[PDB]
Design a protein around this ligand. Structure first.
Ligand SMILES: O=C(O)c1cnn(Cc2ccccc2)c1
Lengths: 237, 300
């Protein structure tokens, strides 16, 4: 069944689950040709597969070579996503395989179900949550590793850094989605808030700054204010 | 010509025989149906006047024996029975008083509708879908579920149609996931035609049987099967030419026979829009497309 806000805390129980977001798999720039036409050029993409309880992100880099000589790429991209997610599940030990995979876009349902036929007890579900995982490429270290790739590549991250040492998975996911929503709403301003104190650094093995508990409270308030400010600007409120 | 003798008609009922129907009143002097033509297959069906719930009926081949109908006051339905003693049957069916209380099967000579609807339907295959080996005839009703439906609860009383499931390992070769889901030719040609049905005649026969069970009994699982078998062909880029041409004829006569007021429940809008306007074989169903657009434009 579809996931939403009534059964929201279920995301953080002990049944292993993965979110899959495909919005950055097939990425293009749009430019003008010599004849005056308009042409696309693909750039490297990624699949965003996240365990919301543990923070484990399986970032599969989609190199532009996979599109070469292929037709109907937006359709193919959904099947490619499903093929790689299935391969990921097959590569995990049984006790690490998910009980549910939640896709952020309903068009991923049939491709993933078909690729997952060998796993009949893994439920494939849409969600009614509007999740901002399309802004994953606004996280600098994720964008860097995707753009530098010269071949298909799987990169592993903990998208919560060390937060679970101090807060619950529920709270960590809420912080993640607030940060990503801010980066999706006003990327340059969200990036500014996070870099504004150069003495609070990002550890080599982290994605986000080493804020104290009180600093995170301030940062989260600044991100909420950014989102509300943009809403008012957009709707003249 | 063949006769279907009725011991009596104790309860008011609408009786169908093949594509025809008439009414019998409670305790009317009714002793059955005479003058039935050439019967490779026939179906006799019932809907009680005092309780339209459960339509039910019997598929039979006059060549496989002598079939009569008798009402059972305990189970409350008209039951088909076979008589092994031919002399006795010949004697009841040739009695001119009995024959005067029988309605004549009304075959217009121009009409070929019944053999267009049932050409590929065979009793031997019906009896594998409807498993009741001690009888030469086969009971179907409005409520009987299909094996597939049961897999998603009395296996004796089930419709054992060939299971068709587009998202199953049987339909999808490992390593060909996208290919086989978008083009069902493998599933049609290798799995179904070569593997299970063996030829297109057996395929069309189950398709036609499913349609007729859906129309005559309002059997939902039969309607699902009919549409599934249509969608499997239309969603295949590679289909023998003879099979496409024959499909257009088969569907044309099914749409032509369908009651006009039954389209909101016997036709699946999604499937028919895909087959007629989006599928690989859209342009291969000219006659079906033309009758659907003029007879049932609202569905499209
Ligand atoms: O057993 C048979 O051979 C048989 C033939 N007809 N019937 C039904 C019937 C019986 C009596 C009078 C009218 C019809 C049974």
């Amino acid at each position: 069944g579809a996931m939403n806000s009534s059964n929201y805390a279920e995301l953080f129980n002990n049944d292993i689950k993965l979110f899959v977001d495909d919005t950055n798999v097939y990425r293009v720039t749009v430019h003008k040709t010599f004849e005056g036409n308009v042409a696309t050029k693909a750039i490297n993409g990624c699949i965003f597969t996240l365990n919301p309880k543990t923070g484990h992100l399986f970032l599969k880099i989609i190199h532009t070579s996979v599109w070469a000589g292929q037709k109907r790429l937006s359709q193919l991209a959904k099947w490619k996503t499903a093929e790689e997610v299935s391969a990921l599940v097959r590569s995990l030990p049984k006790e690490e395989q998910p009980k549910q995979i939640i896709v952020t876009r309903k068009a991923m349902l049939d491709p993933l179900e078909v690729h997952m036929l060998d796993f009949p007890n893994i439920a494939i579900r849409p969600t009614e949550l509007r999740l901002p995982f399309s802004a994953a490429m606004s996280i600098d270290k994720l964008s860097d590793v995707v753009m530098k790739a010269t071949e298909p590549q799987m990169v592993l991250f903990n998208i919560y850094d060390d937060w679970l040492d101090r807060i619950s998975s529920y709270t960590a996911f809420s912080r993640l989605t607030l940060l990503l929503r801010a980066l999706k709403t006003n990327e340059e301003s969200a990036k500014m808030i996070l870099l504004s104190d150069p003495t609070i650094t990002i550890k080599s093995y982290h994605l986000w700054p080493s804020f104290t508990d009180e600093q995170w409270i301030t940062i989260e308030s600044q991100m909420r204010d950014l989102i509300l400010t943009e809403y008012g600007r957009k709707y003249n409120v | 010509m063949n006769t279907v003798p009725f011991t009596s008609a104790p309860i008011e009922v609408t009786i169908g025989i093949d594509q025809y129907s008439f009414n019998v009143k409670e305790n009317q002097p009714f002793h059955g149906i005479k003058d039935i033509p050439i019967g490779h297959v026939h179906v006799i069906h019932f809907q009680h006047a005092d309780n339209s719930s459960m339509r039910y009926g019997y598929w039979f081949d006059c060549r496989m024996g002598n079939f009569y109908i008798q009402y059972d006051p305990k189970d409350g339905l008209y039951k088909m029975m076979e008589e092994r003693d031919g002399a006795k049957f010949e004697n009841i069916v040739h009695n001119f008083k009995e024959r005067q209380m029988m309605v004549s099967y009304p075959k217009i000579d121009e009409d070929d509708t019944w053999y267009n609807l049932t050409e590929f339907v065979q009793m031997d295959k019906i009896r594998k879908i409807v498993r009741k080996d001690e009888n030469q005839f086969s009971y179907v009703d409005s409520s009987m579920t299909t094996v597939q439906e049961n897999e998603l609860s009395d296996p004796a009383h089930s419709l054992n149609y060939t299971v068709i499931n587009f998202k199953s390992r049987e339909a999808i070769r490992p390593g060909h996931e996208m290919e086989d889901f978008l083009d069902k030719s493998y599933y049609l040609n290798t799995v179904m035609l070569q593997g299970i049905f063996k030829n297109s005649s057996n395929y069309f026969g189950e398709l036609q049987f499913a349609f007729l069970n859906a129309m005559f009994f309002g059997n939902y699982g039969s309607s699902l099967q009919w549409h599934a078998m249509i969608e499997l062909i239309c969603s295949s880029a590679t289909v023998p030419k003879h099979m496409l041409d024959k499909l257009d004829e088969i569907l044309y006569y099914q749409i032509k026979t369908l009651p006009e007021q039954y389209s909101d429940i016997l036709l699946n809008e999604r499937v028919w829009n895909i087959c007629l306007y989006s599928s690989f074989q859209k342009n291969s169903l000219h006659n079906t497309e033309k009758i659907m657009e003029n007879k049932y434009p609202e569905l499209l």
